[PDB]
Design a protein around this ligand. Structure first.
Ligand code: HEC
Ligand code: HEC
Ligand code: HEC
Ligand code: HEC
Ligand code: HEC
Ligand code: HEC
Ligand code: HEC
Ligand code: HEC
Ligand code: HEC
Ligand code: HEC
Ligand code: HEC
Ligand code: HEC
Ligand code: HEC
Ligand code: HEC
Lengths: 258, 258, 258
């Protein structure tokens, strides 16, 4: 839980925050309200008795069986409408991960090629080796500058910086560690992440974090005489997984002695 | 032009008839003849040469410049007075809608809060949406029982029943459709009702039929466990605009398939 | 360069091929990959800045100063790993004979007792005799069946059969003659094999091919009433150096007249 000497890059797909900490700017993947209107009202024709245009039950999750629109009273009556421009008045949760996809475990669809589908049949390593092997959360060792630092694992650099971020959007989006961005999705299938095969700490994650998908996650170089087609060697320290030998060492070896 | 399964309620402000079909019972808003006497003769002192107490021109509209009282001859002379107890011998038209109010477009004054003043600056919807939107006169579609019925519009239930009414007064007062109760007021300002902005059929009416004023028009429930403070949900079918989802569907959606 | 009437036995220590013609079955003397993993990754801790886990220089000989693992791109990126299961992707040469042993001339270590260490101080014959003496490559004489055959020398039966072999492994392993299996080891120290002492053709080889080590090289008998503890007499024709008088004659005498 300590970023590279370059601050933990976030040119990846999703900022690691819980869904609730996303802004009302879901507009990039849900293009605009002008299409969202029909994207919602198309659902009224789904049921033969149409979906109630008004939400009289008041349940914060508006099941289409109930309604969406809520009419809140005002001074001297004045029934008004709470809101439908912002998205966090009715969804207010993880809307995805309950969809049809992420129920047949088709997580790769809509999560990018960063991940392999947990049922894709990709290559998982069969050998029971442990000499140079990465572990979830890694382990800690004393660095050359005294500070106890975690090495040989995903938590060696995937870290929770909650305070100072400056992503492209240039707001504050608090980064979160693992075991809350994966549990914050609200899935309850422990067979997926925490099965009990092989008694190797990383072989559970190897499903949908496979070898051929983990050794491709690399962003562009600032100055490495390539400026394109990132070579797996000869790159900056951080900026991905297969960039510089420092990365391979941080996830595979100790990189701080032992 | 077909009422709800409950006959088109008329607990609203005005029965939709033309002014002429009103009875001589203007007494509720013009309290009594005992005050109407001075309400009229007060106007004689307005002009410095007083208003002629007799109407010698015989013009059915008695301009105060002319007189009001008419002396009709009888058998063998016998000059008598036609009448001044009934109101339809001299007014016989729409007296309002030519007043100072309804000339500065202050229609809300004396028409209730049902309407917004056409110059009130109330909220008109700016988005050019059409998926679920109401239109004047609506459109027709085949109902589940064969009869072609109009839906998605004001004319979906605002209807001309000319024959059998039974209002509170328990007389026969023939209800009239739109485009004659609005034109029967005799205003000639087409800029008001039929302007040519936005090319949306209901955005013209949105002036003085606004969103915040149309979603409040709701009468009391017969049996909906409230009997007071009508909730926008959980009410009888008819009885207003924001009573039951059936209403919202009748004016917004189709409510009969498509 | 003609084998005994029994095909040139190969129950000896090493098949005479160059290192490259060895199969990926180095497993017998390097027991298994399961130990080879730590046999390699133990070397990363040797240097204080660890050995780069990735080979970015692309030099086919992977100096530990460089790395070993190479990531070759694929269709649409797809960085994959070339191989590390097979041994001929990185060694591809004579790996031995550059080791610490075979640099202090400790060739006997890891070559068996077949050889004496070139600095062992073993007995070399001091007498300048030539009557019955063996020579490298021998000399040729006409056999009893017309075919010119080489006799009185090591090349009298140490021969290059490149085509049909059938060793224990039962594959094809092309046997090679001398001056390429000794030069194919890639040593450049001519002082060792081709010194200029005594002007006797075999006294150069006598270093690390001494008398007491050359007169012990004998395999088991097929049928010689011993079937164990091979007697230097009374054995089959071939099958070693001190087996039958035919052997002593082939290396010492002519055995075909003169
Ligand atoms: C949940 C599936 C809904 C039901 C049932 C209904 N509406 Fe809806 N509506 C919903 C959302 C998420 C939004 C926001 C759209 C946006 O761009 O933010 C809306 C919006 C409207 C609007 C505004 C029109 C616009 O262009 O912004 C209207 C007039 C509207 N909805 C009407 C409406 C009616 C009449 C319904 C009953 C037939 C109805 N909605 C149901 C979600 C949902
Ligand atoms: C409450 C009024 C809502 C708000 C605010 C937003 N959404 Fe919504 N959304 C709502 C409901 C009731 C439903 C469907 C419920 C069901 O049972 O399916 C949805 C659905 C969507 C969908 C998926 C549509 C589908 O094909 O099933 C999308 C992509 C979606 N909503 C996007 C979205 C966005 C971007 C919003 C902020 C502008 C938003 N929704 C707000 C109810 C409500
Ligand atoms: C430091 C060398 C790291 C270690 C150890 C691990 N990861 Fe990593 N990862 C690292 C960087 C610099 C990035 C790019 C960040 C970005 O957002 O651009 C990544 C990215 C990922 C991703 C992509 C998702 C994303 O938000 O970008 C995944 C799915 C990922 N990393 C997984 C992962 C796993 C499972 C690890 C332990 C086996 C792990 N990473 C270790 C840097 C480092
Ligand atoms: C039009 C503005 C009028 C003029 C000019 C005059 N009168 Fe009138 N008068 C008018 C009305 C509408 C009525 C009906 C009042 C009612 O309650 O129905 C009347 C009535 C009278 C009466 C009856 C008195 C009564 O208590 O009912 C009288 C005696 C009368 N008017 C006299 C009168 C005179 C003398 C006028 C000239 C000075 C005169 N009126 C002018 C309307 C109008
Ligand atoms: C003809 C004899 C009339 C009869 C019958 C009634 N009204 Fe009248 N009314 C009459 C005139 C000539 C005028 C004023 C003309 C003008 O130029 O202003 C009126 C006016 C009124 C008014 C408004 C008074 C004002 O402040 O301007 C009211 C509220 C009114 N009248 C009511 C009224 C009622 C209820 C009547 C039936 C009982 C009635 N009027 C009859 C002439 C005549
Ligand atoms: C309540 C529903 C009403 C009934 C029934 C009638 N009138 Fe009316 N009238 C009403 C109001 C609120 C007003 C405006 C009051 C004001 O101060 O302006 C009026 C006004 C008139 C006028 C005045 C026109 C003018 O120039 O000011 C007239 C001439 C008039 N009313 C006539 C009239 C008649 C003949 C009616 C019976 C058919 C009648 N009114 C009924 C409210 C109501
Ligand atoms: C059926 C669902 C309706 C549709 C479609 C529209 N309206 Fe309506 N309206 C409806 C009822 C049952 C009532 C109460 C009737 C009463 O008189 O009590 C109303 C009332 C109004 C009113 C109040 C005036 C009145 O005389 O009561 C107004 C101004 C009104 N309605 C306007 C209106 C418009 C502009 C519509 C189309 C956009 C429309 N209504 C549709 C039932 C229904
Ligand atoms: C040359 C001395 C190497 C360096 C530097 C690194 N590795 Fe290696 N590795 C090497 C060989 C010859 C092999 C083959 C072992 C075998 O049995 O064939 C490997 C293998 C691996 C593996 C596979 C694990 C397994 O059990 O087969 C891994 C995961 C691996 N190496 C990782 C690794 C890392 C992370 C390194 C940098 C710290 C690294 N290797 C360096 C030779 C060499
Ligand atoms: C390239 C990825 C390699 C492959 C394939 C194999 N080996 Fe290797 N080996 C490699 C390097 C870079 C080194 C060390 C370099 C140095 O400077 O020392 C080695 C070393 C060995 C050793 C000796 C280890 C030592 O103590 O120094 C042995 C015994 C060895 N390698 C065996 C071996 C076998 C059997 C292989 C096929 C399975 C094999 N190596 C493949 C690089 C590579
Ligand atoms: C038995 C006949 C062997 C076979 C087959 C192979 N190797 Fe070997 N190797 C052998 C010995 C006895 C030793 C020395 C052991 C020691 O402790 O030094 C080696 C050593 C190596 C080395 C190390 C070189 C060094 O610098 O120390 C390497 C790199 C090596 N061997 C590679 C290697 C390869 C690639 C083989 C398959 C072609 C192979 N060896 C086979 C014994 C035997
Ligand atoms: C025919 C009589 C031979 C003559 C002449 C020489 N050698 Fe030989 N050698 C011979 C046999 C049948 C064998 C056994 C083969 C086997 O691989 O089992 C050998 C073996 C050796 C060896 C052992 C190495 C090996 O690969 O087995 C050595 C080191 C050796 N021979 C050396 C050698 C020398 C230096 C010779 C000339 C002085 C020579 N041999 C002659 C048969 C015959
Ligand atoms: C964390 C994101 C990693 C980084 C950085 C590197 N590797 Fe990796 N590697 C990682 C995992 C989770 C695994 C699977 C091992 C297991 O037991 O689950 C691997 C595996 C390898 C292998 C083995 C290949 C095989 O087929 O088994 C190799 C050869 C390997 N890794 C090489 C390697 C190199 C050279 C790296 C630096 C460029 C490197 N890895 C970084 C996780 C991560
Ligand atoms: C006819 C009297 C209507 C009934 C019954 C309902 N609505 Fe309505 N609505 C109506 C109009 C004329 C408009 C304006 C749309 C335009 O383009 O002019 C609307 C608008 C809405 C909106 C949009 C709110 C906004 O700020 O734009 C919503 C959310 C809405 N209406 C909801 C709604 C509900 C839930 C209803 C049933 C209780 C309902 N409307 C009934 C006309 C009428
Ligand atoms: C080739 C592998 C040989 C075979 C087969 C036999 N001998 Fe040998 N012998 C060989 C060499 C290279 C030498 C050294 C001679 C030199 O000048 O370098 C010898 C030497 C002898 C000796 C001399 C012993 C001494 O102390 O000098 C004897 C007595 C001898 N050899 C006997 C001998 C016998 C009896 C053999 C058949 C069983 C025989 N040799 C075979 C090489 C080879």
């Amino acid at each position: 839980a300590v970023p590279p000497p370059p601050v933990n890059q976030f040119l990846g797909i999703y900022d690691t925050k819980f869904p609730n900490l996303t802004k009302a700017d879901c507009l990039e993947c849900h293009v605009s309200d002008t299409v969202l209107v029909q994207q919602h009202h198309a659902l009224i024709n789904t049921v033969t008795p149409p979906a109630s245009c008004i939400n009289t039950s008041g349940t914060v999750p508006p099941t289409l069986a109930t309604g969406c629109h809520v009419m809140v009273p005002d001074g001297s009556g004045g029934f008004t409408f709470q809101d439908f421009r912002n998205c966090f008045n009715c969804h207010t949760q993880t809307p995805h991960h309950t969809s049809p996809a992420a129920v047949a475990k088709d997580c790769k669809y809509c999560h990018g090629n960063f991940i392999d589908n947990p049922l894709d049949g990709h290559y998982i390593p069969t050998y029971s080796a442990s000499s140079v092997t990465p572990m979830p959360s890694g382990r800690s060792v004393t660095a050359t500058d005294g500070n106890v630092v975690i090495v040989q694992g995903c938590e060696a650099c995937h870290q929770a910086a909650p305070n100072a971020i400056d992503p492209k959007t240039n707001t504050v989006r608090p980064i979160f560690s693992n075991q809350d961005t994966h549990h914050g999705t609200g899935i309850t299938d422990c067979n997926l992440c925490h099965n009990t095969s092989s008694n190797v700490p990383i072989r559970q994650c190897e499903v949908c974090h496979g070898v051929n998908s983990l050794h491709n996650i690399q962003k562009d170089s600032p100055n490495a005489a390539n400026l394109g087609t990132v070579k797996p060697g000869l790159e900056d320290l951080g900026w991905g997984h297969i960039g510089n030998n420092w990365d391979c060492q941080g996830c595979h070896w100790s990189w701080f002695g032992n």
